[PDB]
From a paper:
Here we show how myeloperoxidase (MPO), a highly expressed neutrophil protein, disassembles nucleosomes, thereby facilitating NET formation, yet also binds stably to NETs extracellularly. We describe how the oligomeric status of MPO governs both outcomes. MPO dimers interact with nucleosomal DNA using one protomer and concurrently dock into the nucleosome acidic patch with the other protomer. On the other hand, MPO monomers stably interact with the nucleosome acidic patch without making concomitant DNA contacts, explaining how monomeric MPO binds to and licences NETs to confer hypohalous acid production in the extracellular space.
In contrast to the datasets of the 2–20 min incubations, we did not observe any MPO monomer–nucleosome complexes when we incubated them for only 15 s. Instead, along with the free nucleosome and the MPO dimer–nucleosome complex, we observed an additional, distinct conformation of dimer–nucleosome complexes. In this conformation, MPO does not contact the acidic patch, but binds to the nucleosome exclusively through the DNA, mostly by electrostatic interactions between arginine residues and the DNA backbone. As we observed this conformation only during short incubations, we propose that it represents an intermediate state that transitions to the more stable MPO–nucleosome arrangement mediated through acidic-patch binding. Thus, the first event when MPO encounters chromatin might be the binding to DNA, followed by recognition and binding to the nucleosome through the acidic patch, followed by DNA displacement and nucleosome disassembly. MPO might first bind to chromatin through weak and non-specific interactions through the DNA backbone, before locking into the acidic patch after encountering a nucleosome.
Author numbering:
A (entry chain G): 11 to 117
B (entry chain H), H (entry chain D): 28 to 121
C (entry chain B), F (entry chain F): 23 to 101
D (entry chain A), E (entry chain E): 39 to 133
G (entry chain C): 13 to 118
């Protein structure tokens, strides 16, 4: 028998493949499952996660900090039009609100 | 005790790949885990419904592609679709 | 056993000064106190039903999350 | 030396719009929740984490409602809020 | 013999609130739907019921929006509706 | 190709009278037409995608009902 | 002699069809023996409740048959049924009559 | 051609009981036929979800009862639950 090669290495990805396949099969979503669906799903999920994390990390540098806290996540999510449209009815714990005042109450 | 699974190592690897020097806390990990689970559930459910509607019992790449095009709004969706195709091609190569 | 009086006036004033209000009238507090109870009851009834169905005598933090999810207000962070 | 009506309110708005703390107190809210839950069952025993989630959801809902009622109030050439605005916002929203 | 302004509007409201039919004509709506659909794809053929379903949904949506706009208008001590009311009504619900 | 002008003026008046109004200004029509176009674009795109997936050339009312349900305006009486 | 399961439970709605639809709809992997009866009874009760009010409303207009306007009138005029079906549009239904008190002439 | 199945005689049978001197039209029949499927799908989906939640693989009477109590608001829940329990008991008696 030859040496085992992980299926994630063949497709050049980072997210797992077998776990997604098993979860899809065991969740009784359909009677049968093909072959390329786990690969497609893993690629899409990896792309979305990378985009969101990159935006959050870029936003978190302004406060002269190093780590990431949910305030930075909220600030990065609410400042992008498409991401705001996607997460339209989601609440994040300890998020706060964007600074915004009306134009009539000002002196 | 029993063993429970999560999505910590992969998220950390992606973060290290994108930004070289940047840490993270536990709350961000929990939020990322919940977000990934929710998105996966939504996409899989939509794909299953669409596959069932056409009097056929199989989930293949076409259903996933149509569900992705239906769910994600705007330019984002476009990019995602392209990415997916490339991955499949590599699997065909080897 | 009157506990709705726990929410006091300065607490309402602090909670209001996050949308951008500048002047507060004298009858808002009673309306807010009346409004809060309906939402609390609506969430708590479903949470208690979910807990009861599983044959348990305690409320987990998870049942509240799936109680909030049905109405249409998701909550990331607790699971 | 006294200020004039209007300045300290703006200062308070600026200070409070830049924090992620918790405004309402803990013990009265916990007692209120544990008393409201008494009407559906008996001798119930809450955990140590559901109360925080309820508090967060309630705070977010109240903040959103207050923002909407402020917009509805300023619509009608005024700088004050009365229960008519709250009732109209609740009716229009769909509740 | 003349009618003072206001009476005919009430008569029309009473007459039109007690019947069910289709108000907008059919052929211009069909042409508009065909053009909008053709904007996305070429060589498209339509059946006979989809047009009716789209017409019904559009009528219901417009009626609901107009009712909400009228309520928002009568809120602010007026009788005539203006585009500001429509914009605010659309904004409050979320679109 | 200015088919959007086929809606004409009195139809808006009839719709408003059905909804219930007593006085209408002179700038409502443009906003009404814009809103209607915006709604129709989204509904038509969502309907077209389904029939594109199924490898067919003729659009049926079933797909329109499905799109209206997915976005959510649930309609009864068309299967 | 074969006897239908609907006759045994004293219900006018079918039992086998509901069981087959539940089994073939991949909702779960096992289905209990007593599941369909509950659903059949609930659906029958709801249909009867709607139809009674529909017929009572239709009787007013000195008519015999039922048209969708009567169904809309019956559904909208009730409280709980409005809450249950406050998210659905009925074709050819009309609108409940109502005029604001301010606009009335005086 | 091909067979298509729908509820078209059970509704008439029910109507012939409450009011014995009233007919129905085609469009009302179509509306009533389309009304049942929505409730059926909602209840079945809620029951499947609740059954999956407790790390169990079975659907029985208790899940349907809980779903009915959760879904139907107001006062109809009591009567519906009572009727369902009575029907189940009568069938069990045999």
């Amino acid at each position: 028998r030859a040496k085992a090669k992980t299926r994630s290495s063949r497709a050049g990805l980072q997210f797992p493949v077998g776990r997604v396949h098993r979860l899809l099969r065991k969740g009784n979503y359909a009677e049968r499952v093909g072959a390329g669906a786990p690969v497609y799903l893993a690629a899409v999920l990896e792309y979305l996660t990378a985009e969101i994390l990159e935006l959050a990390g870029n936003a978190a540098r302004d406060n002269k900090k190093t780590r990431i806290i949910p305030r930075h996540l909220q600030l990065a999510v609410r400042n992008d039009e498409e991401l705001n449209k996607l997460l339209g009815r989601v609440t994040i714990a300890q998020g706060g609100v964007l600074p915004n005042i009306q134009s009539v109450l000002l002196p | 005790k029993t063993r429970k699974e999560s999505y910590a190592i992969y998220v950390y690897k992606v973060l290290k790949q994108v930004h070289p020097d940047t840490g993270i806390s536990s709350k961000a990990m929990s939020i990322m885990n919940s977000f990934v689970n929710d998105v996966f559930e939504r996409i899989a459910g939509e794909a299953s419904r669409l596959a069932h509607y056409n009097k056929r019992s199989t989930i293949t790449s076409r259903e996933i592609q149509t569900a992705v095009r239906l769910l994600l709004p705007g330019e984002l969706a476009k990019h995602a679709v392209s990415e997916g195709t490339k991955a499949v091609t590599k699997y065909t190569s080897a | 056993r009157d506990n709705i009086q726990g929410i006091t006036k300065p607490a309402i004033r602090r909670l209001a000064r996050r949308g951008g209000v500048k002047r507060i009238s004298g009858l808002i507090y009673e309306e807010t106190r009346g409004v809060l109870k309906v939402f609390l009851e609506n969430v708590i009834r479903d949470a208690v039903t979910y807990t009861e169905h599983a044959k348990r005598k305690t409320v987990t933090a998870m049942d509240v999350v799936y109680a909030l999810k049905r109405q249409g207000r998701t909550l990331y962070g607790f699971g | 030396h006294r200020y004039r009506p209007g300045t300290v309110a703006l200062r308070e708005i600026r200070r409070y719009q830049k924090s992620t703390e918790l405004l309402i107190r803990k013990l009265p809210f916990q007692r209120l929740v544990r008393e409201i839950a008494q009407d559906f069952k008996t001798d119930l025993r809450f955990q140590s984490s559901a109360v925080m989630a309820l508090q967060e959801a309630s705070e977010a809902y109240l903040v959103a409602l207050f923002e909407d009622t402020n917009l509805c109030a300023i619509h009608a050439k005024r700088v004050t809020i009365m229960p008519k605005d709250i009732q109209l916002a609740r009716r229009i929203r769909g509740e």
